[PDB]
Amino acid sequence: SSVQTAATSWGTVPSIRVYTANNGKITERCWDGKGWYTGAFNEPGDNVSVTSWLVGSAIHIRVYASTGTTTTEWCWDGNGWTKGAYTATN
Ligand SMILES: Cc1c(C)c2c3c4c1OP(=O)(O)Oc1c(C)c(C)c5c(c1C4)Cc1c(c(c(C)c(C)c1OP(=O)(O)O5)OP(=O)(O)O2)C3
Ligand SMILES: Cc1c(C)c2c3c4c1OP(=O)(O)Oc1c(C)c(C)c5c(c1C4)Cc1c(c(c(C)c(C)c1OP(=O)(O)O5)OP(=O)(O)O2)C3
Ligand SMILES: OC[C@@]1(O)OC[C@@H](O)[C@@H](O)[C@@H]1O
Ligand SMILES: OC[C@@]1(O)OC[C@@H](O)[C@@H](O)[C@@H]1O
Ligand SMILES: [Cl-]
Ligand SMILES: [Cl-]
């Protein structure tokens, strides 16, 4: 089987974030113009999607991590990954 990725970007540098679901776990790689480095995101999941938006120059990232029929939303708003309110009845 294959790892599964999701990607987002912002600005004109740009910043890029790539999330990889590998063998039950999601991790994050980061580009800020000067080489790829490892991000702070680490959460369980077999499937991942992502979206992001800016308020001014402040990025807001939402990562949707799924295992079985449960999807958990993880939020980056400048100061730590927090659990979002997203729910669904799958
Ligand atoms: C994310 C994901 C996991 C965690 C899976 C599987 C798949 C999977 O989806 P994805 O990778 O998108 O799609 C596949 C792709 C692209 C290929 C080429 C596959 C398989 C899948 C399906 C089938 C498959 C699966 C296996 C194992 C051990 C093998 C050998 C295995 O045959 P393989 O010769 O790789 O063929 O179980 P595994 O615990 O990895 O479960 C089942
Ligand atoms: C428990 C279980 C069930 C009930 C599955 C599948 C898997 C599965 O997990 P597991 O067997 O541990 O991991 C896999 C391994 C080790 C290999 C080598 C696999 C697959 C899986 C994934 C992918 C796969 C699946 C298929 C079918 C018909 C094929 C041909 C098929 O490609 P196959 O050449 O076997 O590759 O559907 P199936 O109804 O069997 O659903 C999907
Ligand atoms: O500069 C890297 C970082 O802080 O960027 C914002 C988010 O992508 C974080 O997970 C990541 O560690
Ligand atoms: O500030 C976090 C939050 O309110 O952001 C907007 C949505 O992503 C919500 O699910 C999430 O709880
Ligand atoms: Cl690099
Ligand atoms: Cl964090």
PDB file of C-alpha atoms and ligand atoms in Angstrom, residues 29 31 34-37, ligand 5:
ATOM      1  CA  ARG A  29       6.892  18.514   6.537  1.00  0.00           C
ATOM      2  CA  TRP A  31       8.829  24.628   3.498  1.00  0.00           C
ATOM      3  CA  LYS A  34      14.897  27.595   2.657  1.00  0.00           C
ATOM      4  CA  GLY A  35      14.656  23.795   2.788  1.00  0.00           C
ATOM      5  CA  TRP A  36      12.245  21.161   4.064  1.00  0.00           C
ATOM      6  CA  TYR A  37      12.041  20.591   7.813  1.00  0.00           C
TER       7      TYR A  37
HETATM    8 CL    CL B   5      15.380  20.651   1.105  1.00  0.00          CL
END
